[PDB]
Design a protein around this ligand. Structure first.
Ligand code: DBJ
Ligand code: CL
Lengths: 140, 141
């Protein structure tokens, strides 16, 4: 359903990459953070929800997600708190481009760009960015 | 007003710089507090924006950050056409003021304001938000 996202962390170069996947489309948002703190997580969730209509997020077990800053952000934004493949693709691409830039955070945004624009399938296929927008637009 | 066209503008507040991109056809906004209007910060903001929405053309204020070759390079790589100097933000500073006392730091208040802006129904109860308008305009199927 159009409002559901899943969030995962990937540790790399001594930093964390926070990755949200829009489950129905495979579309991705990601950010590089210093550590998976409650405040970082809350801020990331607030940005996501101000850009897309987030109803529910699926997370893992981390103490970041139960922090009071994350609960305050979720209450304010209206988010209920509770792919392997899209993530495996993502880290794959960061791998294939990491060399083209100094900072991890540059290579990560380049990987997001490449993931979200890439057409899947044949001549009549769609990119993840197209799928998420088509899904949401249809929902109304 | 076509679908790939964004306008980028700077606002200065509490001695901080806010970079704002507006999708001209819908009024939808993306915004971030950045350290200063450097080429590298500008390039990175644009790269993030264009990986999330299909950005074909950007209208900028022709600031020295946009004329740098590091912005030019980011635009070439992303397939974005720069129109430098070619031709509600006071409502943003307003919304920022309406949420400012629920957040210690300006950057959090900015993202709250971005959220209120893109959710707001414009034109009475019969109308649509900027978030509904951008998806409507941009969807290919
Ligand atoms: O895709 C964006 C979108 C689609 C529908 C509603 C929205 C919205 O953005 C932020 C809030 O409201
Ligand atoms: Cl600017």
């Amino acid at each position: 359903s159009p409002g559901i996202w899943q969030l995962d962390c990937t540790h790399l170069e001594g930093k964390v990459i926070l990755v949200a996947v829009h489950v129905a489309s495979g579309y991705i948002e990601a950010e590089v953070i210093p550590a998976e703190t409650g405040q970082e997580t809350a801020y990331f969730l607030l940005k996501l929800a101000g850009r897309w209509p987030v109803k529910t997020v699926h997370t893992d077990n981390g103490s970041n997600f139960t922090s009071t800053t994350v609960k305050a952000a979720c209450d304010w934004a209206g988010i209920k708190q509770e792919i392997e493949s899209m993530n495996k693709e993502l880290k794959k691409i960061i791998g294939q481009v990491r060399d083209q830039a100094e900072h991890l955070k540059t290579a990560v945004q380049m990987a997001v760009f490449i993931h979200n624009h890439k057409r899947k399938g044949g001549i009549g296929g769609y990119s993840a960015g197209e799928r998420i927008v088509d899904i949401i637009a249809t929902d109304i």
